[PDB]
């Protein structure tokens, strides 16, 4: 026996540069990925997230995401101990369509904010959200 | 002159406790709200966000949001100098439907993460996003 | 068995408003405080921190600190499951002498940043470290 | 004319593996480093921090620090817009003597937490503090 997150799914409709987009995101457990174990000893299966972005009949992007897609902007130590939690439509900017992404520490409500930016011609980029602290 | 943000809008479809929900969010400039003046001297008009959540023919929640809806969990100094940027469907939890919310500081890339949780019977709650630090 | 942390101690010399200060901080296990039990089942004894701040022959502040001194700015759920880890001289500001403070969760590298500000006339205030997010 | 931070200085005495250490830290403006400009247009001179760690007659470490010493664990975009604010003694761990370090956004109270670990034989390592977010 081992821990399995529920299958989350959401469809978002929005406009970008005056054109209508449809964004379908589907999270499912991925049994082929390495399992993630916590300090307590409970083993968790990691997830994959399919992001299917379309503009009319055209498919702008159809990618299967895993936490490893953020290996270029997240240190291996925290990335190995975390699981892919979610990818959600956030906003549109002059750069492109921005998605909020998160990897979370299993058995807790703790997560690291990340972002996926997709241009109108399907060029995709990953950025880690920098968290700054204020004293007063 | 008097700077204002573009009108962002998005519609999200998702399931919660096995029932289908439709979430429409509309950000527009609100000329009736107090203006926000930055250190440079540029005056910005603040925004209102209408969140219309429905479950079939029923309307679970239909609220006009402003940064003042977060006055119970954000200090007045930071809140007066910021503008309501966005309210985004994030995920579903046993508590309720969670929305990611943010207020930003004009002419910068800085913003404060907040959250709105709505139950299936329309009970709404506001929270500030807190942090823990992880090292090695 | 009953786990406990080592006794940490440090003495810091610094200037504030042109006057020389001596700051002695001593962490010791406090057997009189309620124990902290983690998810695994290991019970940890909590700590007390004595902060002795002096300016020449005068004692500006001599307080015994516990995690309960931060009950006004930390929720009881998180505070009951954590242990007082440390209080550290950080810097001087126009407000006062700032100390970095932290409460940690046993058997993990997670901890919550907090702060103690002490004025030249010994008026002390507690704050929670908040955050803003920066992207691109 | 241009902005200049005040010269901060602090001496800390502590024990590590049963031996007495003396740690002197001195922050001064460094006119030779590139200046840092904010969104408003105010130019700030960056700082250097001399950390002089001794154990009796021996000098364990005597290094001049700049924000560029953290280039391996902080992205160039945020590092270029920030200035070295401080390096302070935090605690001792089995790895070594840990210092809390911070780079801050000029004209604000915003900073990024970092850490310097120094072993008893002077081997030094840099780590960025990972900030995690909690929703409830």
């Amino acid at each position: 026996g081992l821990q399995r997150m529920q299958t989350s799914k959401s469809e978002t409709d929005f406009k970008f540069k005056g054109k209508d987009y449809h964004s379908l995101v589907s999270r499912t457990p991925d049994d082929n990925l390495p399992h993630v174990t916590n300090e307590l000893g409970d083993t968790y299966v990691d997830n994959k997230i399919v992001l299917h972005l379309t503009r009319g009949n055209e498919t702008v992007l159809n990618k299967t995401f895993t936490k490893n897609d953020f290996s270029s902007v997240v240190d291996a130590n925290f990335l190995s101990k975390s699981i892919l939690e979610g990818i959600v439509y956030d906003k549109t900017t002059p750069q492109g369509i921005v998605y909020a992404a998160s990897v979370c520490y299993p058995q807790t409500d703790l997560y690291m904010p990340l972002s996926i930016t997709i241009t109108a011609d399907g060029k995709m980029s990953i950025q880690k959200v920098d968290i700054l602290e204020e004293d007063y």
Side-chain angles (χ1 to χ4, degrees), chain A residues 1-38 41 43-76 78-106 108-134:
Chain A
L2 63 314
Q3 290 286 94
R4 188 80 52 83
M5 286 184 86
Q6 191 179 14
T7 57
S8 51
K9 186 175 168 86
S10 75
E11 161 73 348
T12 308
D13 293 346
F14 61 89
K15 278 178 186 168
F16 176 53
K17 299 193 168 183
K19 290 284 187 183
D20 297 316
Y21 288 72
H22 281 48
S23 177
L24 178 68
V25 180
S26 301
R27 190 188 76 199
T28 60
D30 187 0
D31 298 69
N32 301 340
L33 286 172
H35 300 153
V36 178
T37 191
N38 64 355
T43 44
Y44 295 79
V45 76
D46 206 345
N47 305 287
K48 67 182 180 176
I49 291 178
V50 177
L51 163 51
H52 188 210
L53 181 59
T54 64
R55 180 186 54 250
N57 296 324
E58 298 177 323
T59 288
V60 173
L61 184 125
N62 183 48
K63 185 161 173 67
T64 299
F65 279 97
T66 70
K67 67 180 189 201
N68 309 110
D69 286 285
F70 305 87
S71 61
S72 58
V73 301
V74 183
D75 66 328
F78 175 70
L79 201 60
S80 56
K81 298 174 183 181
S82 75
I83 62 173
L84 183 60
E85 191 186 33
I87 293 167
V88 288
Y89 170 78
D90 185 69
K91 66 195 182 185
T92 52
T93 72
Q95 275 67 30
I97 301 159
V98 180
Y99 286 78
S102 56
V103 300
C104 72
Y105 238 43
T108 72
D109 211 332
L110 298 156
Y111 69 90
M112 179 179 270
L114 309 154
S115 59
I116 307 149
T117 305
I118 299 157
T119 66
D121 68 324
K123 291 175 176 175
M124 191 235 57
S125 57
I126 303 304
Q127 320 82 44
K128 188 208 211 178
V129 177
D130 275 15
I131 309 182
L132 303 190
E133 288 179 356
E134 61 173 55

